[PDB]
Symmetry: C2
Subunit: 241 residues, 2 copies
């Protein structure tokens, strides 16, 4: 039996990087998307149902969308995190299949160290013809450079970004001359990282906590860094001359 000429328009899906958290660092495109969708999904942890990114998105105004929260597994097994990714993808698919437009809002840039990428990958694999558009956002390291008024990288200097520093990495970490190295998660490995840094020469360090938040702390003094309480939302980059 021939299929027929039925045309059901599924909803449109957006991935939206919203920046480090300051609502002023959203792009105009992000604002237009949030004002053009039915549902906004944001990420929460299992600990609390609070979404920072939901507050950021709501702050911009004109957003009539319904907000829903997705929980992502911060546990170490690949299969449990995969099950959480599959379940959240199914929730999104359920909303899209009824013809509702949805946006997935993520802190930072949507394609750079995000949980959004796993969702988009699975969605496109399962639904090859799906209408999906990605909105880039301002990154945390560019924001740290802006707020500290320190150049991230210029001319023929190379930029390196290292996502998750592990305590068994400080000794192996190299800082080639004329490079800038961003270290993204300095939370519980900061002591060994600082020990490695204090044995290097011709280096400048820019360190930041809570970019765009009330208690935004920025410094370029290593000793101040080592005295600080360990903070999950912390970032640094190391410039080797």
């Amino acid at each position: 039996v021939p299929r027929g000429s039925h045309m059901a328009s599924p909803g449109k899906f957006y991935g939206v990087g919203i920046g480090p958290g300051n609502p002023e660092y959203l792009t105009l495109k992000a604002v237009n998307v949030f004002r053009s969708v039915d549902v906004v999904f944001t990420v929460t942890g299992p600990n609390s149902d609070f979404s920072i990114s939901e507050a950021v998105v709501r702050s911009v105004g004109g957003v009539k969308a319904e907000f829903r929260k997705l929980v992502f597994s911060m546990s170490r097994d690949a299969r449990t995190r995969q099950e959480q990714i599959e379940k959240n993808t199914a929730i999104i698919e359920g909303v899209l299949s009824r013809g509702l437009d949805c946006a997935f809002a993520t802190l930072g840039d949507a394609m750079t160290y995000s949980t959004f990428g796993y969702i988009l990958s699975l969605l496109l694999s399962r639904n090859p013809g799906l209408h999906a558009e990605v909105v880039p956002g301002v990154t945390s390291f560019c924001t740290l450079a802006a707020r500290s008024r320190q150049i991230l990288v210029e001319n023929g200097e190379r930029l390196r970004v290292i996502p998750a520093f592990k305590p068994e990495m400080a000794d192996s970490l190299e800082f080639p001359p004329g490079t800038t190295t961003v270290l993204m998660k300095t939370y519980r490995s900061r002591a060994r990282l600082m020990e490695r840094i204090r044995r290097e020469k011709d280096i400048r360090v820019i360190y930041g906590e809570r970019l765009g938040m009330p208690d935004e702390f920025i410094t370029d003094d290593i000793h101040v860094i080592d005295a600080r309480p360990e903070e999950y939302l912390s970032l640094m980059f190391v410039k080797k001359a």
Copy 2:
């Protein structure tokens, strides 16, 4: 008591006016003078067109000439002259913004200006507005993840043909190559000697001939284009 003007460095993103930040738009609507960069060839500024596109900007637009491939003395004199022009605007109490494509702190001419300006005027009120990068935009438009989990990101500003033999693509890395113009053949030959490698290539992001591909042979067959960008993901 004469208060000098406030100075802004504003990254405006890859060129699409939708990729300006809200802060960038507010700054552009609240300043007296907007400076943009030109080359020595023509006095045309793409970023001036981008900023004028947003609407509501009453500021005067001025051009600053930069040629960053020249000798150190020419670059130093050019930097000093442009800094003096900005100082001339600020000293009359006018707020001004320096608009640059991409992010203001990442491979921009803005940093040289800000360095000299702050050296000459330590007390200057200066604020830098971050912008969306070209490689994040290429990943967004291609719907390809730039980097995830524990993968490392490397950005190389200027690819040279000799890098082809010396360049490493370690597994689990993404390498952005910014300017592969006139060396793209050797880079493609280097890529064809690897397995488990993905290449995302883009020309003219936001322009009429917006071209994006991940097919290496299609890339090798195309004529070389100056405004092109690629990243290389090694699994």
